[PDB]
């Protein structure tokens, strides 16, 4: 089977640098794991690398002495094309329903695995998008229920960075869709930036905004430094939960039978981590 990923930054503006830095970094992790560009669909408003406010033009970093994570990232859905309608079409593998953007979609097969990562603002039962309208959790779950009805994936893992992010799935994500999801925070709780001015470890002084989000960099920095053939989703969740409590409470939803699976089945494996 093929590994697919959909990476979504739900916000825009330089003050939200971190959500797009998280998504660019996630792309780098998946590329090191051997996922192909044709199978990684990126949604990012794309106003950060060339931002009038960026002190390192053309570069995005997601930790204080990190490498540039912007170089190489596909521009599938950027600017006004970062929409709920396009995200739905993409997840459902329906290029005819896409309006604007590259036309890349998750035209996946029953044997394929899918990883979804979202980073931005959240509210009760709702996720931000940088264009109107926002993404209502019930509508996202309805897209996932439809994808399941279509039969076009084997298992799916969703990592979700937002305030009140548990509220995206609590009470509404069924446990029998072969979808396991974790979230940065509880249903009525805030989630946090990391690498922020004024709290060590802090970013370089040219940055007046956080470089990343704690739950997001927790899984990414863990993934790029461990052999993912040997680490399970359960071990990753435990490590991410521990790092994020610092904090907020990382929650899990859906098919908990997926937890003992090795992470490389979703994120790939980097030979350098042996």
Author numbering: 58 to 303, 310 to 337
Anything the authors wrote about it?
Asparaginyl endopeptidases (AEPs) are a group of asparagine/aspartic acid (Asx) specific proteases that have been classified as belonging to the C13 family of cysteine proteases based on the presence of a His-Gly-spacer-Ala-Cys motif. First described in plants as vacuolar processing enzymes based on their propensity for processing seed proteins stored in vacuoles, AEPs have since been described in a variety of organisms and shown to be involved in a wide range of processes including, cell death antigen processing and hemoglobin degradation. The recent discovery that evolutionarily distinct plant families have repeatedly recruited AEPs to catalyze the formation of ribosomally synthesized and post-translationally modified peptides (RiPPs), through the macrocyclization of linear precursor sequences, has caught the attention of drug designers keen to overcome the current inefficiencies in native chemical ligation that limit the therapeutic use of cyclic peptides. Herein, we describe the first structure of an active plant AEP; one capable of performing peptide macrocyclization. This AEP, the most abundant AEP of five AEPs in the common sunflower (HaAEP1), displays structural similarity to previously published active AEPs from mammals, with subtle differences at residues involved in substrate recognition.
The crystal structure was solved by molecular replacement yielding a single monomer in the asymmetric unit, and revealed an active monomeric HaAEP1 (residues 58–338 with weak electron density for Asn338) that forms a canonical C13 caspase structure, with a central six-stranded β-sheet region confined by five α-helices. The structure of HaAEP1 lacks the C-terminal cap domain and N-terminal His-Tag, displaying dimensions of approximately 44 Å x 42 Å x 39 Å. The 1.8 Å resolution of our HaAEP1 structure allowed us to observe a succinimide moiety (Snn) below the catalytic His in a location identical to human AEP that was hypothesized to play a role in peptide ligation. We distinguished dual conformations of the catalytic His178 and Cys220 residues which we hypothesize represent conformational changes that occur during catalysis and correspond to substrate free and reaction intermediate states. Close examination of the electron density in the active site of HaAEP1 suggested a small peptide chain is intermittently bound to the intermediate conformation of Cys220. Given AEPs specificity for Asx and the nature of the electron density, we built and refined a tetrahedral complex of a three-residue peptide ligand (AAN) bound to the active site Cys of HaAEP1 with partial occupancy. Residues Ala-Ala were modeled upstream of the P1 Asn due to the weak electron density away from the peptide backbone at these residues.
